[PDB]
């Protein structure tokens, strides 16, 4: 949460211009191509033997859509991340058993995804804003491990 307002205003700002319909599938899809092992959690989804394969899929995109929401949700609540992701922290840890290290990887893929969509507009300071954020979320998403 510990973000200067300047960063806080910068975030929502950029955040607004985001295609909430595409970005998440972009992120989660990329997560699988870049970090394959992570596929071991989405066998329920289908063809993921090739990139275009993984990328095309509507579940992967359908899902990232849910994931992003959880992010928007997080952004709208920086002073309460731990609380905001509680059941998720359980779902991912207790039930699913996702290694918390993949929370950080997704967090950084999201950052690459944004960067890809806003080009030069995703400036070094803005990125800095987001890193404090994606770290804030991966970190509270793994709390039921703490």
């Amino acid at each position: 949460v510990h973000l200067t307002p300047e960063e806080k205003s910068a975030v929502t700002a950029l955040w607004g211009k985001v295609n909430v319909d595409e970005v998440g599938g972009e992120a989660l899809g990329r997560l699988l191509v870049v970090y394959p092992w992570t596929q071991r959690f989405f066998e329920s989804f289908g063809d993921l033997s090739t990139p275009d394969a993984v990328m095309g899929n509507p579940k992967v995109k359908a899902h990232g859509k849910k994931v992003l929401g959880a992010f928007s949700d997080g952004l709208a609540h920086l002073d309460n991340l731990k609380g905001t992701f509680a059941t998720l922290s359980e779902l991912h840890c207790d039930k699913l058993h996702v290694d918390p290290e993949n929370f950080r990887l997704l967090g950084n893929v999201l950052v690459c995804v944004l960067a890809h969509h806003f080009g030069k507009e995703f400036t070094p300071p803005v990125q800095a804003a987001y890193q404090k954020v994606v770290a804030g979320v991966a970190n509270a998403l793994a709390h039921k491990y703490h």
């Binding site: 899809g29 990329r30 191509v33 870049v34 990139p51 993984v54 990328m55 950084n108 950052v111 690459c112 960067a115 890809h116 806003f118 080009g119 030069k120 995703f122 070094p124 300071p125 990125q127 800095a128 890193q131």
Partner: protein, 141 residues
């Protein structure tokens, strides 16, 4: 080194980099100092602030170093020794800073080369840095 498909793309990623490579490298560095302040205590002698030329030449160094590391791919530990010896031994650099710089590099490449930032090059590029990262890490002592 790794998948010819991986060298295929990595070759083609720096294929549109060209003369910008110096500048892209410095953005990564700049990106790395702003998002991960701690990395700044490795350069307590530079004007780690905006526009510093130090970062500039430096980024060029890293970029070339990389281009150079792209060339002698199947033998990186070899062609990067003087470095293995410099960051691992001379400066003792925690590998978490390598993962950080590699990440800042993908973001820079992503911000400037959208058409070339395909998930496939993203994976290919990220592995290449995992490796370059290791070589400057597979010799400490």
């Amino acid at each position: 080194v790794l998948s010819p498909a991986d060298k295929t793309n990595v070759k083609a990623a720096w294929g549109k980099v060209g003369a910008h490579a110096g500048e892209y490298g410095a953005e990564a560095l700049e990106r790395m100092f702003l998002s991960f302040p701690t990395t700044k205590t490795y350069f307590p002698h530079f004007d780690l602030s905006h526009g510093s030329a130090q970062v500039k030449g430096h980024g060029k160094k890293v970029a070339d170093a990389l281009t150079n590391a792209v060339a002698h791919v199947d033998d990186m530990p070899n062609a990067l020794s003087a470095l293995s010896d410099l960051h691992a031994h001379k400066l003792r650099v925690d590998p978490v800073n390598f993962k950080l710089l590699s990440h800042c590099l993908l973001v820079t490449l992503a911000a400037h080369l959208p058409a070339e930032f395909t998930p496939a090059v993203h994976a290919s590029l990220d592995k290449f840095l995992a490796s370059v990262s290791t070589v400057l890490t597979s010799k400490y002592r």
